[PDB]
Design a protein around this nucleic acid. Sequence first.
RNA 1: GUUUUCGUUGUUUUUU
Lengths: 263, 133, 140, 147, 97, 113, 66, 436, 49, 84, 47, 49
Amino acid sequence: EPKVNIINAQDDEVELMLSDVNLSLANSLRRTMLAEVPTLAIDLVEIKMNTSVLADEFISHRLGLIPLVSEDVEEMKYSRDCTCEDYCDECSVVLELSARHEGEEGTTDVYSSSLIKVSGPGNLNVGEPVRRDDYDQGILLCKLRNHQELNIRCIAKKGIAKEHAKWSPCSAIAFEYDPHNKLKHTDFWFEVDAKKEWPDSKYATWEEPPKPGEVFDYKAKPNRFYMTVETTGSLKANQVFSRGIKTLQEKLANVLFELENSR
Amino acid sequence: SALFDDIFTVQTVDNGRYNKVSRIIGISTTNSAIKLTLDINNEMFPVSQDDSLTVTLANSLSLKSWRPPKPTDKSLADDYDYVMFGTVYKFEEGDEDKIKVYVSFGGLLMCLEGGYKSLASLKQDNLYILIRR
Amino acid sequence: YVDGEEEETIMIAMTPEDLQTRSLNDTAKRIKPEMSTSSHHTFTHCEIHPSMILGVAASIIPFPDHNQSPRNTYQSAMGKQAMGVFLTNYNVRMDTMANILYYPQKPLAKTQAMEYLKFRELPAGQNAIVAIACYSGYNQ
Amino acid sequence: RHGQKGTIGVTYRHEDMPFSAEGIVPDLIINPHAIPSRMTVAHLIECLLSKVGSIRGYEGDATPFTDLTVDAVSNLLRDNGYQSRGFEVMYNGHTGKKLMAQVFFGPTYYQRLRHMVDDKIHARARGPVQVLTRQPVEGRSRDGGLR
Amino acid sequence: LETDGINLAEVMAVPGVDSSRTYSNSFVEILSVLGIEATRSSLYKEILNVIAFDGSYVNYRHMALLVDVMTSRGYLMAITRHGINRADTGALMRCSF
Amino acid sequence: MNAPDRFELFILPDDVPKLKITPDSRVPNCIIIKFEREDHTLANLLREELALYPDVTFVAYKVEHPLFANFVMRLQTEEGTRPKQALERACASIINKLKTLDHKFNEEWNIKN
Amino acid sequence: MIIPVRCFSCGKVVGDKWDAYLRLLEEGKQEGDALDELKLKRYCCRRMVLTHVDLIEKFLRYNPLE
Amino acid sequence: LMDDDPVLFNRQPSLHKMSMMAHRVKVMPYSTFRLNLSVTSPYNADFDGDEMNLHVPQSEETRAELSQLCAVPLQIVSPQSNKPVMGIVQDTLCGVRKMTLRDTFIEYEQVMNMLFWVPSWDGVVPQPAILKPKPLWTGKQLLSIAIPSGIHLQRTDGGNSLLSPKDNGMLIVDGKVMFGVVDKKTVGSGGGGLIHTVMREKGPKICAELFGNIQKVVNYWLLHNGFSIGIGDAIADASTMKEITHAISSAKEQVQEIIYKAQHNELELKPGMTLRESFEGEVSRTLNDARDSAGRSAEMNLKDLNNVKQMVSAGSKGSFINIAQMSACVGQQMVEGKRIAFGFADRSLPHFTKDDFSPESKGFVENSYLRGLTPQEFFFHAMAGREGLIDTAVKTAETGYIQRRLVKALEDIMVHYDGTTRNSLGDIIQFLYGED
Amino acid sequence: NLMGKRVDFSARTVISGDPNLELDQVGVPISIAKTLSYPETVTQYNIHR
Amino acid sequence: ELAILKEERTTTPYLTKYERARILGTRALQISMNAPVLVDIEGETDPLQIAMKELSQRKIPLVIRRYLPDGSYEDWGCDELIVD
Amino acid sequence: DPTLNKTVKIRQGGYKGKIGIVKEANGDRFRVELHNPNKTIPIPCSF
Amino acid sequence: NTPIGRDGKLAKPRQLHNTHWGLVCPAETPEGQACGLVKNLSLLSGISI
RNA sequence: GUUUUCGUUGUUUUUU
Ligand SMILES: [Mg+2]
Ligand SMILES: [Zn+2]
Ligand SMILES: [Zn+2]
């Protein structure tokens, strides 16, 4: 019954036609991808030493805000699950940055490229700093001036956006359906008229404008929805879609497993 | 089982301030002086002036916690096209033959001016109002 | 210049426009005076910019001429209690109290004099997407 | 910037907020009740023009006694392909549903205040007392006992 | 007729005047001429007149007790330091006031 | 300083089950499901699918209070169907629908590229 | 004081584009035009950089103790 | 300190006994005190930065005494004017105002959810108001479900009919909403209110659970509808401002004719009130009439959908003159019961000539906040606001002094087994408490 | 010191509003409850507890 | 001379909320002190519910002493007060 | 107890991989302070 | 600053007077005791030496 | 080994 028709797809985004499904189901899946997608971000930030002008916790926070290539996050265990004393390579990853500005004048702009995958549960393609482009140094991290050195060693761990928004893989995920308010699910505010005062939905083309004399059908229901699946770059919009679906599926399977086991 | 029946031509329809619902004035074409006022959802059952409407009232539609109506079961409503569940909040004992039976359908009101015998059977508590087409 | 007492014995033009005797009908604007009781005017001075009668804190409000004066006074008093960037040498200074916004933003709606006040240069807040609504009865 | 002090009721996650057709959720929600009570018209003008600039990419003057009309701002916004009065359809984030009305929605400059919550939290069961009267000492900083 | 200034006894007997319903806004003259209880009556009347002038209502019994309390001895016990402290009640209270 | 832990939003404590059943004596064949570590995402999804079932008399869920990762639902399947079986039926139905959409999206992503 | 890593509202990473955005500014390209170049449509994103204030340099201006 | 334990509850200033209460503990994380939104009314507080105080019992007799005496439900009614003090407020109040709108329809599953939102629900779902073609429920139905049984109410709003052509008036039977739109006049703190009768009949616990369920369902429905407000709500159509301007012109003409009247020594003298004072009174009355007519015309122009109009009708916040000043005209300025004076010699401002008397020339505002304020009217408004704030600051302290003196005046008086009212000395005050 | 006075087993903080709370109920920060305590006799009905 | 005879107990036969609560607290404290219970305890481990139960059953073995303003006292037995 | 006032880190549990110090060790149960959070938590000796 | 003292409430001093026109901030003022008395230089007020 | 303590009085500021 469920249907998919990609209108526009991209690495970061997937914009598709999801129809023949429920409003509640679409919202639940959107929530699944947005919050219920485990990912990997800088978590344990540890300073061997610092000389910059910013609060160590501030830098740590900005570091956590860094999306990391998380293709194989599906594979690496949560740190909590692993029984090894302290961490091991199979339950966390080791990166390091260590930037120094030399020269009495100037300012060394530390970049995420300076972050480097020191370790990680190889050969998992994880822990790689995400970048628009290889020539793209990445996100500007820090500015080091005369006699300002920076040495740090961090540890990241797989987690979910529910735990902290840094794990949010999707930069944004919109939603709509029935742009013409055919279902009349909203009352349009206006002074003279909603029509001449309200713009038109970008997806309005997909649904005809209701006829003037057409009588309202109270059997009308939300069927065709509209979507664009943005990713912050740590993962692909297609991978994000599939992995969120798989996470919902695993949650349901676990729920039914509990249904049978508790009985 | 119809506790009352009559057909009414809508003298006037009044949306007024409300839009989904119109207050209507109709006189029984079968018998004058039976002044019926009723409140009905415009969209869920649109109408217009001078519409002749069958009107019927029965205390039970079975031919207590409400449940979705199984399509298997039948009902006197199966013959009708707009049905409400209501409550009898004022069965007026008015003039010699002016009996004003007022029924509230969870907010929807109705003024039923007419003969006592026409409304003598209608001294009830919860009455279903049944309208054809 | 004019002191308080000198202000009395003079006639000022509350706007540069008002100097020239004028000769329309917009519902989205304030209303200017009639000025017809005296067919002749001999103006002496003009208001450079009338909005300069404010205080430093008072001027931060946008369109203060559209809210109630007590609200303006409250905002004026409180603004001095919102945290933000006040100095650059903070790190060297050893002060008992010091709190700073991570990312102060120059307000989207900014008044003119703020340039003189460097507030855009030294902002103490952030512009945030907001919704004016009753969502979960917890916003009361 | 209009005497509209407010304390944090509760925070909602990205999904938890209601969302626009564009997917934009408000950073913060406020009570419509205050506006009619407080007549913060300049507040609405501020949020409107803030949205206008953000869409348009510039910084607008907020000087009072300036004839910048709200109707002109509405013209500009409608030109921007947006509801002239800032109303935007918004959806239940919990179910994805439309919301039966449309929402005045936009940005606004806001300010955090020194009176943080734990600045004031205090309790006392037993401890320092005034030697002179053997009564609980004063001052939250000093294990103050509620007078 | 509504008069400016108050001269109770003189006006009441004036010809053309209802001496039996003549009223003064000053309860002091009521005590002077109309003794204690009528003074309490005018007292409460004016009290409520001011209190309910807004239209707001308060349960009668409370104001009744109030006016009663201050008429206990048979004269005016003005609500100030002197009258309350002049009370013969426990020193530990009157001093505390 | 009294704020609860963030990581517990999804961690189920061992002593408590992920789900808890309770029959609703007040009406026939009605149960009560106490939930842990779940929100509208699963609640509404299961609720809608079940509400589409014909053999259900009543079904409704609510979150007692946002601060707690636990909510409740009151199901009543008509006499033939005990609530638990309709619940697992909805579980399997959503499972198959999600798998269908999953394979469909696989196909559409493959073809689009 | 520095560019935010992400967009508070949606969480779009924004810090990298700052230097590029500043370059766009160098040639006086209109704020809206440059914003459009950066493919930053949502004013939830546009707002910060449109009114983002950067002042780390003032800290660099200060002679570091070492 | 375990949950549900009775504890004290005290806020300041403690003007009257309702200023404090005792509550059952419900511990949660986070470091703030959480209050059911109805409790605020007697506490007359908002979340603009208000603190709180509490005290914990350390004995059982104290615990029993609190539980049995300071139980908040016991104090629902206020002997102050022998009426309820709390009431349904703010989001809940305006929301319920809209629930009771005649053309209100609710879907099956949605009704299922609300019915589940009541922990005091019978477990028996009501039948829908409409059964064909689509089964639907009205918000009145759910509200009635919340209400307990055996309850009754009527109120004839303005001499209306049972048919309620305006949807006004109200009637409840067995707790079943028969008709009407619920409002403050119904569910506020007013006397006799639904809440009041619930207290009287079903005692404290039932009436408190009533508030709880009302909040639950009202807020849940609102959530699933949402409500907001926009700037457009405060602006009218062009023709309305045209009429307002014509009215303003007519009023200013009236004032100018009054001026020509008085200046030629022709204006009649008011009783005990001078020609200057009569002139001032006539001018003030003219300006009041002008603003009243203007705001009336504006309000009449308003559409029912207007969130401002919805809000004033709900009344949980806002008032008519709020609309008048917001949109139509702030109006005439008043200071110490008079107009703006000549703080400068023979004139209030240097920007005006000497010896002018036009309404604006002595503190009339014609614009509104939407129209913005010219500097002179801005300053007059600022003067008025400073005056009012000063008066509030003075009044609060002086009234506090008066209250302190009074409470010291009557701190010992008691009613006794005899029913008499005697002091600590035993001197009877009243032969019978309230004579009753 | 005699009418008014500082009293132990007393706490102060900001108020909060909650539709999900009962009228007589109140939301108490947990740390406060842990800090505060109620002396209570050791009885048979709670000895194990 | 100090008490008043049982016959002239002119006071109302109801129990004042004051005396009611005093009785409840006193009984709850007594039982909390391991006082023998004049009713049964099923699961009401807390004193106060037991005290309220014993009150409703009117099985509380205490006597009021109502000091009149004159000073005279009259003694009312817990069991005879009309619980409302 | 001289086994206190020393750097201690967690091997297993909900906060696996966090540095901390020991303050109170009444008996057979150790309470530990943490660095990133301004909180002190209990934990059995063996973790 | 207004060194008039708080002895005697009065209204003239705290009240705003037309003769501050363009001299002190009309809106900004303290609250309660200090309200209406302490003032602030308007943006164009200048002090003679 | 149980055990065990920090000041005042003012001022000014705001906090409702
Ligand atoms: Mg306050
Ligand atoms: Zn490991
Ligand atoms: Zn964004």
